[PDB]
Design an enzyme around this catalytic site. Structure first.
Site, short mmCIF file in Angstrom:
data_model
loop_
_atom_site.label_atom_id
_atom_site.label_comp_id
_atom_site.label_asym_id
_atom_site.label_seq_id
_atom_site.Cartn_x
_atom_site.Cartn_y
_atom_site.Cartn_z
N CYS A 14 0.85 -1.16 0.00
CA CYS A 14 0.00 0.00 0.00
C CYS A 14 0.88 1.21 0.00
CB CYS A 14 -0.89 0.04 1.23
SG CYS A 14 -1.90 1.56 1.32
N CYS A 27 0.07 3.99 3.45
CA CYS A 27 0.39 3.66 4.83
C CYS A 27 1.60 2.74 4.80
CB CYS A 27 -0.76 2.91 5.48
SG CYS A 27 -0.96 1.19 4.88
N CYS A 29 -12.14 -14.81 -11.65
CA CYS A 29 -12.98 -15.80 -12.30
C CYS A 29 -12.79 -17.17 -11.65
CB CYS A 29 -12.69 -15.87 -13.79
SG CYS A 29 -11.06 -16.62 -14.20
N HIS A 88 -9.64 -18.75 -18.63
CA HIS A 88 -11.00 -18.39 -18.23
C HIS A 88 -11.88 -19.59 -18.00
CE1 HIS A 88 -14.05 -15.59 -17.22
NE2 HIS A 88 -14.90 -16.07 -18.11
N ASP A 133 -22.17 -17.85 -16.85
CA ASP A 133 -20.97 -17.25 -16.28
C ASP A 133 -21.40 -16.36 -15.13
OD1 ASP A 133 -18.75 -15.42 -15.73
OD2 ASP A 133 -17.89 -16.15 -17.62
O1 LIG Z 1 -10.33 -9.94 -20.40
C1 LIG Z 1 -10.00 -11.29 -20.08
C2 LIG Z 1 -9.99 -11.47 -18.57
O2 LIG Z 1 -10.32 -10.22 -17.96
C3 LIG Z 1 -11.38 -10.36 -17.02
C4 LIG Z 1 -10.96 -9.78 -15.67
O3 LIG Z 1 -9.83 -8.92 -15.84
O4 LIG Z 1 -12.57 -9.75 -17.51
C5 LIG Z 1 -12.40 -8.43 -18.03
O5 LIG Z 1 -12.50 -8.44 -19.47
C6 LIG Z 1 -13.78 -8.38 -20.12
C7 LIG Z 1 -13.62 -7.80 -21.53
O6 LIG Z 1 -12.36 -8.18 -22.10
C8 LIG Z 1 -14.81 -7.54 -19.35
O7 LIG Z 1 -16.12 -7.77 -19.88
C9 LIG Z 1 -14.80 -7.88 -17.87
O8 LIG Z 1 -15.80 -7.16 -17.16
C10 LIG Z 1 -13.43 -7.54 -17.34
O9 LIG Z 1 -13.41 -7.78 -15.94
C11 LIG Z 1 -11.65 -11.84 -16.86
O10 LIG Z 1 -13.05 -12.09 -16.84
C12 LIG Z 1 -11.02 -12.49 -18.07
O11 LIG Z 1 -10.43 -13.74 -17.70
ZN ZN Z 2 -2.68 1.33 3.43
#
Ligand SMILES: OC[C@H]1O[C@@](CO)(O[C@H]2O[C@H](CO)[C@@H](O)[C@H](O)[C@H]2O)[C@@H](O)[C@@H]1O
Ligand code: ZN
Ligand SMILES: OC[C@H]1O[C@@](CO)(O[C@H]2O[C@H](CO)[C@@H](O)[C@H](O)[C@H]2O)[C@@H](O)[C@@H]1O
Lengths: 320, 57
Positions: free
Chosen positions: A158, A161, A184, A211, A228
């Site tokens: 962080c 702090c 995910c 994913h 999903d």
């Molecule tokens: O993009 C792939 C990877 O990103 C994640 C989280 O970072 O989802 C993101 O990407 C999507 C569009 O590319 C968005 O719709 C989503 O909201 C965003 O969080 C994972 O879901 C994925 O493995």
């Molecule tokens: Zn902090």
């Protein structure tokens, strides 16, 4: 002449049944070897075998189901499902209710229950603090957080702090039930189990390009459905390949009743090369595991499923 | 020898056999009203014919 066919139709259904039963009978040791072989020959295969050994059963554990059933707000859930059912006038006296259930679990989980964790919040500082967090990279779990199913902790500093906050990555879904946040990985893990705790028919679907999500069998739609939990999405397999425009290679799903290659459901463009494994092998691989998996079921359960199987196959290759 | 069934039929064939057995006759029907060479095996022995079918699956 004037053949007339039910005389012949019926004959078929009958010989077909036996055919099917024969397949899902004897574990003939010609395969026992061909299988055994492949699990050393090609490691991708080995990969999925290992995945099946975990995924295909962990979630069918009734202690867990009850822990979650305690923990969720079953009140609020059903309350809503009943609201959104009353609105419907779809099909007379039909299984559509369980669809609403899913959809509601879907929103409950995302809106109320569980949190998305990009970088963690700084536990010393306030609560909504996560950019004055800079990644120090990963390390092994503190032993205390190995009590749960954690093989690695992403760690953060962080900037406000100057304290370390940790973000351990756990596979124990019950643990997640307390931390209530993840990516995910965790999202799908817990939500798969949430679903199974309603004894819905669920699959956990693994996409090779980092994913994961799940599949649920809607009886009213009479087919597997893409759920999903992250994206709060019910039945839209195209999301990944078209909306995200994501390049995908293999998509395969694991469920207590089978392991099946569900690629053609998802990988509808941006198709990478398949080649960690020969195609015929991958087929066999599943069929074999699915068989092993279904080994101890009565004759008409076996058939009934092997049908739902071929239903899917036809939906996959005909790719409606 | 081998069936000789259209990729689309052989498909819907195995679809309905597994998903809608009720309609499998009228399919079996039309499918025959379309493959002369097969209609033969039917006329001169349903048995041989059906065995051939099970080869596709
Ligand atoms: O993009 C792939 C990877 O990103 C994640 C989280 O970072 O989802 C993101 O990407 C999507 C569009 O590319 C968005 O719709 C989503 O909201 C965003 O969080 C994972 O879901 C994925 O493995
Ligand atoms: Zn902090
Ligand atoms: O937060 C994502 C969530 O919203 C839904 C609601 O129907 O719609 C989205 O679908 C696409 C990607 O998820 C986006 O292109 C679209 O803009 C967005 O509204 C769900 O599909 C999804 O789970």
């Amino acid at each position: 002449n004037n053949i007339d066919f039910d005389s012949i139709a019926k004959m078929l259904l009958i010989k077909y049944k036996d055919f099917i039963l024969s397949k899902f009978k004897k574990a003939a040791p010609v395969e026992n070897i061909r299988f055994q072989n492949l699990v050393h020959t090609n490691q991708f295969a080995q990969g999925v075998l290992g995945q099946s050994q975990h995924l295909c059963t962990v979630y069918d554990n009734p202690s867990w189901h009850s822990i979650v059933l305690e923990t969720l707000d079953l009140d609020l859930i059903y309350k809503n499902v009943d609201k959104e059912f009353a609105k419907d006038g779809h099909a007379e006296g039909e299984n559509i209710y369980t669809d609403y259930l899913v959809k509601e679990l879907l929103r409950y989980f995302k809106q109320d229950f569980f949190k998305w964790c990009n970088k963690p919040d700084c536990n010393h500082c306030g609560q909504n603090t996560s950019e004055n967090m800079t990644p120090l990279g990963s390390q092994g779990p503190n032993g205390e957080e190995s009590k749960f199913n954690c093989g690695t902790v992403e760690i953060y500093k962080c900037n406000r702090c100057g304290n370390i906050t940790r973000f351990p990555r756990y596979n124990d879904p019950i643990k997640l039930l307390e931390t209530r946040k993840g990516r995910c990985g965790e999202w799908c893990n817990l939500f798969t189990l949430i679903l199974k705790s309603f004894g819905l028919d669920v699959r956990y679907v693994w996409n090779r390009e980092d994913h994961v999500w799940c599949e649920y069998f809607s009886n009213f739609l009479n087919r597997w459905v893409h759920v999903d939990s992250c994206e709060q999405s019910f039945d839209q397999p195209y999301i990944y390949s078209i909306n995200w425009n994501k390049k995908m290679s293999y998509c395969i799903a694991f469920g207590k009743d089978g392991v099946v290659d569900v690629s053609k459901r998802y990988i509808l463009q941006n198709e990478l090369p398949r080649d960690q494994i020969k195609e015929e092998d991958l087929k066999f691989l599943c069929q074999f595991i699915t068989k092993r998996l279904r080994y101890s079921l009565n004759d008409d359960e076996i058939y009934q499923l092997a049908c739902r199987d071929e239903q899917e196959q036809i939906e996959l290759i005909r790719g409606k | 020898g081998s069936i000789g069934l259209t990729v689309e039929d052989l498909l819907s064939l195995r679809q309905v056999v597994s998903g809608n057995p009720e309609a499998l006759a009228p399919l079996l029907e039309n499918i025959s009203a379309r493959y002369p060479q097969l209609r033969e095996h039917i006329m001169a022995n349903p048995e041989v014919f059906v065995s051939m079918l099970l080869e596709a699956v």
